[PDB]
Design a protein around this motif. Structure first.
Motif, PDB file in Angstrom:
ATOM      1  N   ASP A 150     -14.206  47.108  54.941  1.00 45.79           N
ATOM      2  CA  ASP A 150     -14.338  46.718  53.535  1.00 45.79           C
ATOM      3  C   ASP A 150     -12.974  46.865  52.874  1.00 45.79           C
ATOM      4  OD1 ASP A 150     -17.024  47.284  54.431  1.00 45.79           O
ATOM      5  OD2 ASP A 150     -16.657  49.337  53.741  1.00 45.79           O
ATOM      6  N   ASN A 151     -12.905  46.536  51.590  1.00 47.60           N
ATOM      7  CA  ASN A 151     -11.632  46.598  50.879  1.00 47.60           C
ATOM      8  C   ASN A 151     -10.573  46.041  51.820  1.00 47.60           C
ATOM      9  OD1 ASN A 151      -9.399  49.140  49.436  1.00 47.60           O
ATOM     10  ND2 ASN A 151      -9.638  46.930  49.080  1.00 47.60           N
ATOM     11  N   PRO A 152     -10.692  44.752  52.174  1.00 50.47           N
ATOM     12  CA  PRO A 152      -9.724  44.127  53.073  1.00 50.47           C
ATOM     13  C   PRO A 152      -8.333  44.414  52.545  1.00 50.47           C
ATOM     14  CG  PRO A 152     -11.561  42.685  52.744  1.00 50.47           C
ATOM     15  CD  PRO A 152     -11.683  43.769  51.704  1.00 50.47           C
ATOM     16  N   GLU A 153      -8.255  44.610  51.238  1.00 51.43           N
ATOM     17  CA  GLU A 153      -6.996  44.898  50.578  1.00 51.43           C
ATOM     18  C   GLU A 153      -6.396  46.197  51.115  1.00 51.43           C
ATOM     19  OE1 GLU A 153      -7.122  43.385  46.490  1.00 51.43           O
ATOM     20  OE2 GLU A 153      -9.257  43.915  46.474  1.00 51.43           O
ATOM     21  N   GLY A 154      -7.220  47.233  51.243  1.00 47.08           N
ATOM     22  CA  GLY A 154      -6.737  48.497  51.770  1.00 47.08           C
ATOM     23  C   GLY A 154      -6.342  48.311  53.225  1.00 47.08           C
ATOM     24  N   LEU A 155      -7.189  47.602  53.964  1.00 47.98           N
ATOM     25  CA  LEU A 155      -6.935  47.327  55.365  1.00 47.98           C
ATOM     26  C   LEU A 155      -5.642  46.529  55.478  1.00 47.98           C
ATOM     27  CD1 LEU A 155      -7.914  47.759  58.108  1.00 47.98           C
ATOM     28  CD2 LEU A 155      -9.265  45.668  57.968  1.00 47.98           C
ATOM     29  N   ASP A 156      -5.572  45.426  54.739  1.00 47.62           N
ATOM     30  CA  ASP A 156      -4.382  44.585  54.742  1.00 47.62           C
ATOM     31  C   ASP A 156      -3.155  45.435  54.435  1.00 47.62           C
ATOM     32  OD1 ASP A 156      -2.388  43.056  52.642  1.00 47.62           O
ATOM     33  OD2 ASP A 156      -3.008  41.710  54.278  1.00 47.62           O
ATOM     34  N   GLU A 173      -7.482  53.977  42.858  1.00 51.13           N
ATOM     35  CA  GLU A 173      -7.558  52.544  42.541  1.00 51.13           C
ATOM     36  C   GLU A 173      -8.065  51.837  43.803  1.00 51.13           C
ATOM     37  OE1 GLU A 173      -4.340  54.895  40.827  1.00 51.13           O
ATOM     38  OE2 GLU A 173      -4.882  54.264  42.866  1.00 51.13           O
ATOM     39  N   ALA A 174      -8.439  52.638  44.799  1.00 55.89           N
ATOM     40  CA  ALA A 174      -8.942  52.114  46.052  1.00 55.89           C
ATOM     41  C   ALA A 174     -10.294  51.472  45.788  1.00 55.89           C
ATOM     42  CB  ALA A 174      -9.081  53.239  47.082  1.00 55.89           C
ATOM     43  N   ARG A 175     -10.670  50.551  46.666  1.00 54.99           N
ATOM     44  CA  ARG A 175     -11.944  49.884  46.544  1.00 54.99           C
ATOM     45  C   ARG A 175     -13.051  50.860  46.933  1.00 54.99           C
ATOM     46  NH1 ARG A 175     -12.072  46.709  43.481  1.00 54.99           N
ATOM     47  NH2 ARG A 175     -13.062  44.642  43.354  1.00 54.99           N
ATOM     48  N   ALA A 176     -12.733  51.794  47.825  1.00 59.15           N
ATOM     49  CA  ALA A 176     -13.701  52.794  48.259  1.00 59.15           C
ATOM     50  C   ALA A 176     -14.238  53.497  47.015  1.00 59.15           C
ATOM     51  CB  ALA A 176     -13.036  53.811  49.189  1.00 59.15           C
ATOM     52  N   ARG A 177     -13.328  53.925  46.156  1.00 59.38           N
ATOM     53  CA  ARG A 177     -13.701  54.604  44.940  1.00 59.38           C
ATOM     54  C   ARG A 177     -14.631  53.755  44.085  1.00 59.38           C
ATOM     55  NH1 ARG A 177     -11.198  59.203  42.938  1.00 59.38           N
ATOM     56  NH2 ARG A 177     -12.234  59.751  40.966  1.00 59.38           N
ATOM     57  N   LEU A 178     -14.557  52.442  44.261  1.00 59.59           N
ATOM     58  CA  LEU A 178     -15.409  51.554  43.497  1.00 59.59           C
ATOM     59  C   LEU A 178     -16.856  51.620  43.937  1.00 59.59           C
ATOM     60  CD1 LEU A 178     -14.257  50.189  41.154  1.00 59.59           C
ATOM     61  CD2 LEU A 178     -12.652  51.078  42.837  1.00 59.59           C
ATOM     62  N   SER A 179     -17.346  52.861  44.029  1.00 58.17           N
ATOM     63  CA  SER A 179     -18.731  53.203  44.359  1.00 58.17           C
ATOM     64  C   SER A 179     -19.095  53.865  43.030  1.00 58.17           C
ATOM     65  CB  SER A 179     -18.798  54.233  45.490  1.00 58.17           C
ATOM     66  OG  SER A 179     -18.531  55.544  45.019  1.00 58.17           O
ATOM     67  N   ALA A 180     -18.221  53.606  42.070  1.00 61.85           N
ATOM     68  CA  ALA A 180     -18.348  54.079  40.716  1.00 61.85           C
ATOM     69  C   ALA A 180     -18.847  52.943  39.808  1.00 61.85           C
ATOM     70  CB  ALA A 180     -16.991  54.584  40.233  1.00 61.85           C
ATOM     71  N   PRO A 181     -19.208  51.777  40.377  1.00 59.91           N
ATOM     72  CA  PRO A 181     -19.669  50.741  39.448  1.00 59.91           C
ATOM     73  C   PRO A 181     -21.137  50.882  39.050  1.00 59.91           C
ATOM     74  CG  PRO A 181     -19.748  49.839  41.583  1.00 59.91           C
ATOM     75  CD  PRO A 181     -19.054  51.201  41.723  1.00 59.91           C
ATOM     76  N   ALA A 217      -2.756  48.640  54.724  1.00 58.94           N
ATOM     77  CA  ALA A 217      -2.524  49.537  55.852  1.00 58.94           C
ATOM     78  C   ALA A 217      -1.757  48.798  56.951  1.00 58.94           C
ATOM     79  CB  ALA A 217      -3.859  50.062  56.393  1.00 58.94           C
ATOM     80  N   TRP A 218      -2.296  47.653  57.382  1.00 55.68           N
ATOM     81  CA  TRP A 218      -1.666  46.823  58.413  1.00 55.68           C
ATOM     82  C   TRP A 218      -0.259  46.457  57.941  1.00 55.68           C
ATOM     83  CZ3 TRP A 218      -6.655  43.393  58.782  1.00 55.68           C
ATOM     84  CH2 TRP A 218      -7.398  43.733  59.935  1.00 55.68           C
ATOM     85  N   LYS A 219      -0.212  45.894  56.738  1.00 56.58           N
ATOM     86  CA  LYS A 219       1.009  45.459  56.065  1.00 56.58           C
ATOM     87  C   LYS A 219       1.835  46.665  55.618  1.00 56.58           C
ATOM     88  CE  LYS A 219       1.711  42.191  56.080  1.00 56.58           C
ATOM     89  NZ  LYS A 219       1.815  40.760  56.467  1.00 56.58           N
ATOM     90  N   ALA A 220       1.904  47.700  56.452  1.00 53.65           N
ATOM     91  CA  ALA A 220       2.661  48.911  56.121  1.00 53.65           C
ATOM     92  C   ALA A 220       2.819  49.825  57.331  1.00 53.65           C
ATOM     93  CB  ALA A 220       1.980  49.666  54.990  1.00 53.65           C
ATOM     94  N   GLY A 221       2.293  49.396  58.471  1.00 52.90           N
ATOM     95  CA  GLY A 221       2.417  50.183  59.688  1.00 52.90           C
ATOM     96  C   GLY A 221       1.570  51.433  59.931  1.00 52.90           C
ATOM     97  N   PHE A 222       0.395  51.544  59.311  1.00 53.95           N
ATOM     98  CA  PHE A 222      -0.437  52.729  59.541  1.00 53.95           C
ATOM     99  C   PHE A 222      -0.929  52.719  60.976  1.00 53.95           C
ATOM    100  CE2 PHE A 222       0.210  53.307  55.368  1.00 53.95           C
ATOM    101  CZ  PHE A 222      -0.838  53.582  54.487  1.00 53.95           C
ATOM    102  N   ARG A 223      -1.127  53.909  61.532  1.00 51.38           N
ATOM    103  CA  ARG A 223      -1.647  54.035  62.881  1.00 51.38           C
ATOM    104  C   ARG A 223      -3.189  53.968  62.742  1.00 51.38           C
ATOM    105  NH1 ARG A 223      -2.356  59.518  66.370  1.00 51.38           N
ATOM    106  NH2 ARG A 223      -3.313  58.503  68.199  1.00 51.38           N
ATOM    107  N   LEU A 224      -3.700  52.744  62.604  1.00 47.38           N
ATOM    108  CA  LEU A 224      -5.137  52.482  62.454  1.00 47.38           C
ATOM    109  C   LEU A 224      -5.977  52.843  63.661  1.00 47.38           C
ATOM    110  CD1 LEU A 224      -5.946  51.472  59.752  1.00 47.38           C
ATOM    111  CD2 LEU A 224      -3.609  50.758  60.378  1.00 47.38           C
TER     112      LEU A 224
END
Ligand code: MG
Length: 616
Positions: free
Chosen positions: A522-528, A566-574, A530-537
């Protein structure tokens, strides 16, 4: 006092059972949590049947009474120590006299009846031929002295082919509440029936006492307004006055007696306040036991003064006045065992774990004191617990939550009114007078409180409070009446932890440093990102650091979890789409966010398990 007060959050029940309760009682998740904990599962648990309990000796006792009645034997009834004994004898005296018995109360015969524990005797009661629940192995009911008197009259009616004596349930309920017995099962059913009958009681004295105190059908009004008036008469040596109020059918005489009970209660109050004023300032500090002597104190008021001291102090209290002694205790310290440790010094004593009584030559007081102080020293300090049902829901849901909790009544020794936890930075604070009393807001919810010496609330507070429906000017307002309030602290609850909240900033720093990490699909943005920054996924079952929540359980892990800011994960607050079990989801979400922000591993871990479930 307050530093020995622990707050605990009640456990979340298993989802399938939580759901079963919500469905079978037709209520949201908050109230269902309360019902699940109090053992209410089906609709009939809220309204148990009022039935004739099969207490041992009940049948023989009723048969004996049928014989006494028919043969015209002289019946004497005894029981005047307190409201439970007095209402119980009023039941037997009025009830048997209505059947044509030659019965009379005995205020200090062929058959002798004693309420609340030749010539035949029936010891028809409870308290520590005897009719008593405890004699009945496996019966899980706790009727009181008046409850058993009521059952006995009922057993007799059954033998005589008469209907249940329900018009006596108001008297029986008053004794039950006054006895402070657990309000569940049979006792809950009895009280519901009796509280409903008081406004139009067949007993004019009870109806008038109830109206005098502004009765509106609440068990709490009986506990704090009705029973104390009756008990004061007895504590003050005028038990006949109270008994007569319960036996007369003459409204004018009853009216006069109500006036008399009001006077006796005012006297009890006056003496009690003077004793507490003199005693409370004494031997209280951090003593393991408070032991005070008041030579000329009135023995009739020391019991309540002792409880009041124990409450301000959270310590066992022993008071001696005119050679009579009273004990109120708590925690791991047994009242009667403390007296036992000093028994050679006493003329006599008796009691149980929370209350005990004795007599003793006051000359032996110093010796008695060292002894009980030493007994108390053998145990850990007593601690008070505040049980929290759950985090308070959003303002928009309070009315519905309030109406759903309503079914829990009558509240009492058995089921105390539930307390919710509120948390935050108080706002719009405003004193009310020149001291303690004040009001403020937490997340839009108005709360009223008595600030323990200090006033001015810390920047952040925690509140244990009662959801209240306050009426005014013909309008309702849903607010919280704070019972306890504090700067956030240790908070008990949750399960064995496996997920450990970590602030998003800290988590991202470690992820940029190369720590193996999991970012949900989820939050492809966070994933993107992460990828677009070199995280060890990595997949959740192998990453020790998470930036979001996996879709399904991943146990046997022990991980650190971050959501964001500001993560999408946190958006369990809607805000949801209410009413259905959408509210169950909302409760889990608010719990997750709360435990996350508070870095509470147990609650967060527990909440996460419910989270996997509410999505399966
Ligand atoms: Mg009793």
């Amino acid at each position: 006092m307050r530093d020995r007060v622990r707050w605990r959050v009640l456990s979340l029940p298993p989802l399938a059972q939580w759901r079963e309760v919500m469905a079978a009682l037709e209520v949201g998740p908050e109230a269902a949590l309360a019902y699940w904990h109090r053992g209410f599962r089906r609709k009939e648990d809220l309204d148990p049947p009022l039935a004739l309990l099969p207490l041992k000796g009940l049948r023989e006792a009723a048969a004996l009474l049928e014989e006494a009645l028919r043969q015209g034997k002289r019946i004497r009834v005894h029981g005047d120590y307190d409201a439970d004994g007095l209402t119980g004898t009023a039941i037997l005296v009025r009830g048997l006299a209505a059947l044509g018995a030659d019965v009379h109360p005995f205020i200090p015969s062929d058959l002798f009846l004693t309420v609340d524990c030749g010539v035949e005797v029936i010891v028809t009661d409870h308290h520590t031929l005897v009719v008593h629940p405890a004699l009945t192995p496996d019966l899980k009911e706790k009727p009181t002295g008046a409850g058993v008197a009521f059952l006995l009259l009922w057993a007799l009616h059954e033998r005589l082919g008469l209907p249940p004596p329900l018009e006596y349930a108001d008297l029986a309920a008053v004794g039950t509440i006054a006895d402070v017995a657990p309000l569940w099962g049979w006792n809950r059913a009895l009280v519901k029936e009796g509280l409903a009958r008081i406004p139009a009681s067949s007993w004019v004295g009870l109806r008038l006492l109830a109206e005098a105190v502004g009765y509106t059908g609440k068990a709490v009004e009986v506990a704090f307004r009705i029973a104390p008036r009756i008990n004061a008469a007895s504590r003050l040596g005028e038990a006949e006055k109270a008994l007569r109020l319960l036996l007369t059918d003459d409204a004018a005489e009853a009216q006069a007696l109500v006036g008399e009970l009001h006077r006796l209660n005012a006297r009890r109050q006056t003496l009690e306040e003077a004793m507490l004023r003199k005693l409370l300032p004494q031997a209280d500090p951090e003593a393991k036991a408070i032991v005070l002597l008041d030579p000329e104190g009135h023995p009739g008021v020391m019991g309540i003064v002792a409880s009041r001291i124990l409450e301000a102090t959270l310590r066992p209290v022993f008071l001696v006045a005119q050679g009579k002694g009273t004990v109120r205790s708590l925690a791991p310290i047994s009242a009667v065992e403390a007296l036992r440790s000093a028994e050679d010094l006493l003329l006599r004593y008796g009691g149980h774990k929370e209350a005990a009584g004795f007599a003793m030559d006051e000359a032996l007081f110093p010796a008695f004191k060292a002894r009980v102080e030493a007994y108390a020293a053998r145990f850990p300090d007593p601690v008070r617990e505040v049980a929290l049902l759950d985090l308070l829901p959003e303002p928009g849901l309070l009315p519905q939550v309030f109406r759903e909790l309503a079914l829990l009544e009558p509240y009492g020794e058995g089921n105390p009114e539930p307390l919710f936890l509120l948390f935050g930075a108080p706002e719009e604070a405003r004193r009310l007078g020149e001291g303690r009393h004040l009001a403020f807001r937490l997340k839009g919810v108005r709360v009223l409180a008595w600030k323990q010496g200090d006033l001015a609330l810390p920047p952040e507070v925690e509140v244990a409070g009662l959801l209240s429906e306050n009426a005014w000017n013909g309008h309702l307002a849903y607010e919280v009446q704070a019972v306890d309030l504090r700067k956030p602290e240790a908070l008990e609850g949750g399960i064995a932890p496996f997920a450990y909240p970590l602030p998003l900033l800290e988590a991202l720093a470690r992820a940029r440093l190369g720590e193996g990490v999991y970012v949900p699909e989820d939050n492809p943005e966070g994933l993107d990102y992460a990828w677009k920054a070199g995280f060890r996924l990595l997949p959740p079952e192998e990453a020790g650091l998470w930036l979001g929540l996996p879709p399904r359980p991943v146990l046997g892990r022990r991980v650190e979890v971050a959501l964001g800011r500001e993560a999408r994960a946190r958006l369990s607050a809607p805000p949801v789409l209410h009413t259905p079990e959408a509210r169950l989801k909302a409760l889990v979400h608010r719990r997750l966010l709360f435990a996350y922000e508070r870095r509470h591993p147990g609650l967060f871990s527990e909440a996460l398990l419910a989270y996997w479930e509410v999505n399966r």
